[PDB]
Amino acid sequence: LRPEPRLITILFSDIVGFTRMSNALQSQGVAELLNEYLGEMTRAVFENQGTVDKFVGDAIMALYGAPEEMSPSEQVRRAIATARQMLVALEKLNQGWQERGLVGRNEVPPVRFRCGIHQGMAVVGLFGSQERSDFTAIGPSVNIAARLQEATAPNSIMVSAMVAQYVPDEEIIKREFLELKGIDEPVMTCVINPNM
Amino acid sequence: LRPEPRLITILFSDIVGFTRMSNALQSQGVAELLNEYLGEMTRAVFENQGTVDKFVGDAIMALYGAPEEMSPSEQVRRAIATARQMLVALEKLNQGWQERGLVGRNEVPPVRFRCGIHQGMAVVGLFGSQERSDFTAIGPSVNIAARLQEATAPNSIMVSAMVAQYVPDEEIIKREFLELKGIDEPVMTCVINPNM
């Protein structure tokens, strides 16, 4: 399970305006909301055979194609299906939170998230020390997926040109070159239809 | 071990220019270098009784005061001692990498890192789902530690005013208010002497 180059698909989802929300809600509520959210979103990943790499604050990092082998087309099919399922689950989560006066009330709006997906080469395996290590992916490909997530609009799914090669033309909303932090050359991005 | 408010100290260390280095070095070398680095840096954390929260790419997140209770003064003493020990270990790591032509040669410079340390309230405990959860800290206090790391110069240690309350005046190099992403009010920062 040592680190080696591999073609994988990385998905990043990140809650919109979690900072403000993490101030207008008691620590008790913030913890419950975030965990209820993470529970449903990780379910979306697992049900689509993805791997939950880690959580980073209000974000979820998911991998497709590692550790288990997966074809390039299936990696994309599953990652997009995951993102679309996450949005569906979110709509249901907010209905419940609304009734519990956890969102929509006071100054905390319904939860929304941004999602970026990129497919490319990465060094994947166990990183860390003998005392503490974790399976993850390293390389510019991971940075790209993260910048796509940060660049896209709330409740939207932005993917790279690589990922878009496997997506029907009818499902591509917008094609646009963007300058992503850390990457020299402009990156072609495609916002895809959020509906399953 | 459920999430609850707690006064803790968060330390973030992040490799300078890892992107460029993660391109001028074969995936094999990048993986070895990063793991050798992580091995020595996590050792610094553990030997100073800190907790390794997680790794985020080229960064290490460490906590002091959770899960094990620790006084505010000891949290700071240990976090700073950790940062200072990390710099010392780095100097030794580069000597070895230099001899192995892993750094200093071609276009890959000796490894350097940025470090930010902040102490404050955070909701700490297990976050995630029944299927996958991890012990971590959540809240603006964590964002502050991360922004201090990003704001400081290579091979330097930047801490917040809270942390500086426990640091001798002779060890404070520079005091300066900085606008950190995500935080409304300006944050008072203090760059501390890197030598043990």
Ligand SMILES: Nc1ncnc2c1ncn2[C@@H]1O[C@H](CO[P@@](=O)(S)OP(=O)(O)OP(=O)(O)O)[C@@H](O)[C@H]1O
């Ligand atoms: N538990 C954690 N583990 C690791 N890094 C963390 C962290 N919590 C925070 N950080 C770091 O602090 C940064 C900001 O934390 P957010 O991600 S919770 O907040 P935002 O999404 O930027 O804010 P928004 O736009 O209002 O939703 C993270 O990116 C991490 O680098």
Ligand SMILES: Nc1ncnc2c1ncn2[C@@H]1O[C@H](CO[P@@](=O)(S)OP(=O)(O)OP(=O)(O)O)[C@@H](O)[C@H]1O
């Ligand atoms: N394994 C991983 N797990 C989680 N997030 C990751 C990741 N790898 C990358 N990211 C995300 O991608 C971002 C950039 O990756 P870097 O941290 S390796 O690179 P830099 O430090 O910004 O570059 P530098 O200035 O040249 O040293 C991370 O902050 C994460 O949000």
Ligand SMILES: [Mg+2]
């Ligand atoms: Mg967010």
Ligand SMILES: [Mg+2]
């Ligand atoms: Mg975030």
Ligand SMILES: [Mg+2]
């Ligand atoms: Mg870095």
Ligand SMILES: [Mg+2]
């Ligand atoms: Mg980094």
